[PDB]
Symmetry: D2
Subunit: 385 residues, 4 copies
Amino acid sequence: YQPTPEDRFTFGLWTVGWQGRDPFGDATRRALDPVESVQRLAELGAHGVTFHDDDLIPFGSSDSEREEHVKRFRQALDDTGMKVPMATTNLFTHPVFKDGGFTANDRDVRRYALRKTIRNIDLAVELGAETYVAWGGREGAESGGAKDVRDALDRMKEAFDLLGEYVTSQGYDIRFAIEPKPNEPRGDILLPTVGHALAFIERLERPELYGVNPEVGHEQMAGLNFPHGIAQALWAGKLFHIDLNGQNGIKYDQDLRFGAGDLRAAFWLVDLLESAGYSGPRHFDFKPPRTEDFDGVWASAAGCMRNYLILKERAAAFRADPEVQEALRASRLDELARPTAADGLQALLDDRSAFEEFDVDAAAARGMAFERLDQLAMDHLLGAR
Amino acid sequence: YQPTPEDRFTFGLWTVGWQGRDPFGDATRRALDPVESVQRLAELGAHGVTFHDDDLIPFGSSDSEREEHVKRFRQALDDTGMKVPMATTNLFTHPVFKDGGFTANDRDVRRYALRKTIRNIDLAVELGAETYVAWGGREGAESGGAKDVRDALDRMKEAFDLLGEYVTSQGYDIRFAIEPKPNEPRGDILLPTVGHALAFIERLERPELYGVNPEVGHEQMAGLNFPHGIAQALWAGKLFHIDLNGQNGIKYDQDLRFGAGDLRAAFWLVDLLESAGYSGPRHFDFKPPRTEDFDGVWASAAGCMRNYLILKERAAAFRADPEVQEALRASRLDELARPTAADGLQALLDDRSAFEEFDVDAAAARGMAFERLDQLAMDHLLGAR
Amino acid sequence: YQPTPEDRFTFGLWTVGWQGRDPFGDATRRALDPVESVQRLAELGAHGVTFHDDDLIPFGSSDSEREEHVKRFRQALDDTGMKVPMATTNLFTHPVFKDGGFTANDRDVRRYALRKTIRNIDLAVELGAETYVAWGGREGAESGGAKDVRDALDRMKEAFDLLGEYVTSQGYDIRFAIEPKPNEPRGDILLPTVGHALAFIERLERPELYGVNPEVGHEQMAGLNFPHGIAQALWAGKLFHIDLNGQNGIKYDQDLRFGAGDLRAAFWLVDLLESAGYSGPRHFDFKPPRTEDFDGVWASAAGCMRNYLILKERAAAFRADPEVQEALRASRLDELARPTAADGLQALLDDRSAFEEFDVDAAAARGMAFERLDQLAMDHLLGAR
Amino acid sequence: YQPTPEDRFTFGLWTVGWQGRDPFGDATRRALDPVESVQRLAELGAHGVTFHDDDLIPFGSSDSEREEHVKRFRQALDDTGMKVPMATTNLFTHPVFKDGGFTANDRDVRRYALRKTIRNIDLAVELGAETYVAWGGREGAESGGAKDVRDALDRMKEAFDLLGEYVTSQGYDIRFAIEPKPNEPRGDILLPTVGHALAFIERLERPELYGVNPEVGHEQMAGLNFPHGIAQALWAGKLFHIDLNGQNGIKYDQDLRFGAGDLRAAFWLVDLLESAGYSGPRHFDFKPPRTEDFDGVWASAAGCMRNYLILKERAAAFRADPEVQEALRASRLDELARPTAADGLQALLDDRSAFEEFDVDAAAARGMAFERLDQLAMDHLLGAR
Ligand SMILES: O=C(CO)[C@@H](O)[C@H](O)CO
Ligand SMILES: O=C(CO)[C@@H](O)[C@H](O)CO
Ligand SMILES: O=C(CO)[C@@H](O)[C@H](O)CO
Ligand SMILES: O=C(CO)[C@@H](O)[C@H](O)CO
Ligand SMILES: [Mn+2]
Ligand SMILES: [Mn+2]
Ligand SMILES: [Mn+2]
Ligand SMILES: [Mn+2]
Ligand SMILES: [Mn+2]
Ligand SMILES: [Mn+2]
Ligand SMILES: [Mn+2]
Ligand SMILES: [Mn+2]
């Protein structure tokens, strides 16, 4: 199950580059040069990398150092054929961001956040990114009086409307993807789930420029079904990008390699991405555990891609099995896809078979046959089929 | 802290009427006649009651029994001055609903669900309800292959579009409020949070007919900040109705009396409802614990209203305290309410004070003074102020 | 992967016999006669069944009806060769139990709970059970003032000490297994996890008569690692019995068939049970979803056993693979099993290589190689090995 | 509500000294000198401070620097009258600890962990500590094959037995308190709750030397009732020390000031500590949010003490109110405290009023009156009484 660049696997610089500093411990690994990560990921079969501004150009770099970091990076992409499909801004590490970027209470900080963002959109375009992610990890509060959330959503809409004005003014071909997270590092983060981010987008001045970048572990931090939230984002036409990883339930954001965590959810997510024909990058936002040395980093990144390809093969064998197609009909999945009342309202109202003569007891007695379908899915996942 | 009808407190018939049957135990209380609940709630100071169809007219009642249940009920409302501001449909108890109402896999059941719904909308209008709630507690799945969620959202949009066609065709003055819940009784429920329900509404044919009816305990079942989700529903103009209760964290849906559960969240929710001027019903969707007899039922319903009125007084004393107004300025809440860039994009781009000459270290060093503000809020809640 | 009676798979009568009544819905299946469940489970390859008193003899049965229910049951066990390795008492359904059995505030109810229990211990012995489970699902509270927990633990120790006096007085060969659950149906249940139940046992008059019956879904309702809690129960010598099922995270108690829920946890649990040589029953405490008819009931019960046998084969292939044995040495699992200081305290204190001359930087730089080990485990589980 | 040293309030050096580095951000505050924290806490009314070795003497300090840090510290305690009732070891920050201290897979690291521990026990004794805490935050795993937990509990018992040998050999008057935490920074931490730590202690060679140091936010990270776990630790005689703080549900470890988080749980915890007569330190293990400057640090530490004193006054007014004493009798709290069967087993067995003539329906019909009791508790907490 060997990845190639045609599988569209991507990685953040900050993922394999995570030094292992956690809330309770020092770094366990030395910093990697971005050039070295590009080379090593290209050897494992990835298609490309992504970056925050500050991963690529150290905070406070002069214009001359900037251009040098960029030139070196561009050389490694040329040398390897790696692409950069997505970029984002760090509006969370520097102390100035301690109360947020776009929704900081201090107006001066909010203007600074927008300026730092627009400078990186230009860079992203130059390097060919098609998607610009926004994770507002510092937007929110630990206490109720610290943040009026209606005012905060006004400031958040204002920031995103200004960015959509900027891109359209420049004539760039870049769309935005907002990434929800329910908590951590703030006590509560604004737009905490995919549903909250989708609903927010519909109030922007140009909603067609914005979609979501959901992350597996983030929706599971709220105990939600990740494949169900992705189906809603697909239904709305707003799955612009995705972050793949693993999480063991409701606790701190673990960012385990993809396939770790909830393995059945991983299976039904691949099933959905492949059957809806998602064609964006398969991006891993993960942290090799701090127990690992460099060898363990590259083994963890390789397992991300391996697990995706194994689950892809098992979900395709599941949907291709005639015995599964028969079970799906037995459970009336075909009937869920037909209109309830294509005949229209008046006809429904006049239909005695829908009410006055509907035999509720006979309908109630029909089993759904879901457990037999779910064991076929289990047998397929385990290769016991 | 005595409620009057002017406080707009309402209760479902199923709340004080809960017989105490749980997944592991039999009923501990006899059934109440709806007429008796109307009388007892009017004595405690409530403004009105709400109902599912099946709470008021027993499932399978003939037209003659129907009209009799309605006449008796109408007499008790006349006798007490109680109103009925909201009604909803039971699409969850009868076995026919075991796979959903509007998104059941069986198309016949979906048509039946719409017919049962429209019959109750007529009744609701006749009794004067202004809001019709929809809680799809059976819409969802315990396993991944049982429900294609894109098809299920197609069927859910189809159902709600047909209901909006019906109400507009009849010329009724009734709006719909969808109530999210993340799980229970299904393994995962579709539109599991306020954000998911808001985003869904924006894809209906006539979005202006639909809002949300969030419930305190339901968002806390996903570990989310209830006051933050209500602020987003207010920001979108979609807070049509609300269900008030208490929940102790992420576990089964407890439906404790309001003020039980997370008491600080209760305080910041009342603070928000009163400061945004929400004018809908203050409705309690709660279950007096099955340990209680009838005396304990009416004591629990009275505590719902008492706790709301105490929290209202403390939140108003908080916002009225000059020392709190000073702390809010100290924490720059005034600055969060001002536009970040009313000057426009070009001016922001030309402003050297926003970037090239912005002193990040001086801005970073400014404390937010949030803990002093939050202890003032604590002192106010406890009356230690 | 066909089960036989030698695999020691057992089922509660209440599991396949669950009629599908949930907090929001009516029964979707008719009641099964215990005789019919015995016959059907024996056909699928189970080894035996378990019962609460009230599953086998309807509450309030006269002595004559009692003896008749027992005789019929005994005939079906004779006809099939099924055993009864475990029995328990229903101290949760009847309204009298609304505040608990052994820790009800009313003393009369507590004495009644003990009498109902002892009557069923006699029956259990007669039918050959070796383990008597105690699940105190009504022991706990929805509010802080309702239960003094020190007094409640006094009453709980008193009840269990009286039962251990009874069994020793009668000379029965039966041990007790307490089953923890953190909540539901009470707001909080006493002894909410395996750790709490283990610690409690050590304060009983004869601790050797009591162990734990942990359930997969119950520890995961507190977000805990089920295999880690079982290793602690094994370490203490107190794994008397186990309840196998599946749960999707922190929410209501789902009781899905075994292998559903957290599939990797299922794998590491089988790995542990088989490698520590657990020889008790493999008992399924699960509920076929209420979407199912009778066909779906027996398919769900068969999948419990199938999934156990598949995971058993994959965990055995994992531990048998030379490449895995090499990885375990690479990650120093062999060193975890050696004493840290068999040399004794004084020698440790005099050892300069343990402190004064210990090279912390060289030790820190050694990678643990855990991600490579965990991908081997993944490949084994998926059959991609 | 002004604290004095007689209230026994203590703080870790690492609490007010937290620089605000989180998994996503840099420090927002400069480091404090321990001498300055001693002085500032003594001014706010605290009784004493606690320390990890590495908070007081920077890692890798020579013997001469060691003695200097100690002398300066001792001078500040002399100058202020502050005591040091508890000390602990840092076995979590340095990279060498990435797989644990006492249960690291590498045996050399385990011996190093014990040596670093024993050196700090000597210091703790010299400074007068009576309790030595052990928080094994690095003991556990992110993956199932990385840690055999039976071997890991063998190594953990071996470490604690060696420490109990050491203290008894030296004739020190110091006891150990193990602090549970369910996760973070490891995926799962061993002995994850108070129940797990209590049960473990009973397998040590000298159990009387060891108790628990439970933390409010840690049990709530597993969704458990903190006051119920403290009642069990009190019931076992093992509440040696306690860590007070606040947490908003199941998510990362927030360490908010005490009274933040779950305020009703805070009330019932103070009620319990004061009514059982706990006489150890009231220690705050909290982090002033990184939004704060130094002024906000000392305001947050003062609110910890203020909130404790307010809750103490409200819980004492609750238990002193004659109307509450009457409600407690109405809910049969007096009957929970009487033996169920002081008459003995034989008498219970011969008592027809316990079974054959027990009127279950009359007992079932008695209401518990818990909601009226719980609203009295609410009125008391809010000062509405
Ligand atoms: O998810 C996280 C942090 O939780 C980030 O890696 C975003 O994806 C990009 O800033
Ligand atoms: O919330 C619930 C069930 O959880 C219902 O009472 C809805 O409010 C109306 O059907
Ligand atoms: O676990 C449960 C209910 O949650 C019971 O089936 C016990 O196992 C036996 O009473
Ligand atoms: O609780 C924590 C970290 O979560 C520590 O402060 C311990 O109390 C002492 O090491
Ligand atoms: Mn993440
Ligand atoms: Mn991400
Ligand atoms: Mn509810
Ligand atoms: Mn509701
Ligand atoms: Mn269960
Ligand atoms: Mn069980
Ligand atoms: Mn903590
Ligand atoms: Mn602590």
